[PDB]
Design a protein around this ligand. Sequence first.
Ligand SMILES: Nc1nc2c(ncn2[C@@H]2O[C@H](COP(=O)(O)OP(=O)(O)O)[C@@H](O)[C@H]2O)c(=O)[nH]1
Ligand SMILES: [Ca+2]
Length: 306
Amino acid sequence: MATLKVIGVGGGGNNAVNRMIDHGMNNVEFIAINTDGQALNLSKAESKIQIGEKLTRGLGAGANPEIGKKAAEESREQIEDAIQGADMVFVTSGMGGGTGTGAAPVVAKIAKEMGALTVGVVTRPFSFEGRKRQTQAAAGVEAMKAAVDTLIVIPNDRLLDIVDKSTPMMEAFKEADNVLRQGVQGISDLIAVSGEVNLDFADVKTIMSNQGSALMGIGVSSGENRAVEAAKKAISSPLLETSIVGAQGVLMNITGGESLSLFEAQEAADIVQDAADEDVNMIFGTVINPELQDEIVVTVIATGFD
Ligand SMILES: Nc1nc2c(ncn2[C@@H]2O[C@H](COP(=O)(O)OP(=O)(O)O)[C@@H](O)[C@H]2O)c(=O)[nH]1
Ligand SMILES: [Ca+2]
């Protein structure tokens, strides 16, 4: 049974790991990586790797990515030991800073060289943080892309679009965590359950292995048009840099009660096929969960973007 690990690198990444632990999560081992030893000490994670102690003496990297990179390379062996056993690694980090921008691509490379299916979920900085930080974040993104199997980018500017003028920052940040947390739970649930039309970790590898950009989403709905509405919500990408448009591979799992109809599955599949605007290699699954009365859950992982 496949082991999933979530690895937070730098301040943003360790904040995401803490908020996900607070939210509550099972069958996933969390690893916190940072140069900042003060922040690590406040990590709710079980495994904690302080990187670059020699180099930073427990301080953060400031805004210099080469420090993050060297810190990660210095601590390769400890990174390897914490990863060991992972079939899948999710690497989360905020791009722009000195630790994440530099260290996260190295953590990704290590995870992948060890044989883990390696997914990145990273932020780009807010426009208000200024051009040099945006440009620094962009070099990190490109480095992440070269190091991972699949990459999901969340531009922090998109948080301003969905939030209104009084939404607390911390509630806004929680919206960005949903991306990673629902992707991890969707895959976790696929592994755990033998569905009526079953998808497993081999199907995750087919869609995600050596692919570049990705979209991961979950949609939930009920009543009339539940299938169309849940599929639409699975692929709606307000926070994402990569939309469904141009996807050539899709993993799509539908979960419902005993009322789940064949017609509904087709409708959901067509919503996704049509929104991609490509001939999509669909890998389809269905799970009957009799606990569900009138809800259906549509899970989408999309890759193969040119
Ligand atoms: N969405 C989100 N973005 C964050 C968070 N913390 C930091 N950031 C963003 O990530 C960037 C890097 O900050 P940080 O990770 O602390 O730098 P590092 O520790 O040097 O890697 C910042 O410029 C922000 O754009 C967070 O909790 N949520
Ligand atoms: Ca399954």
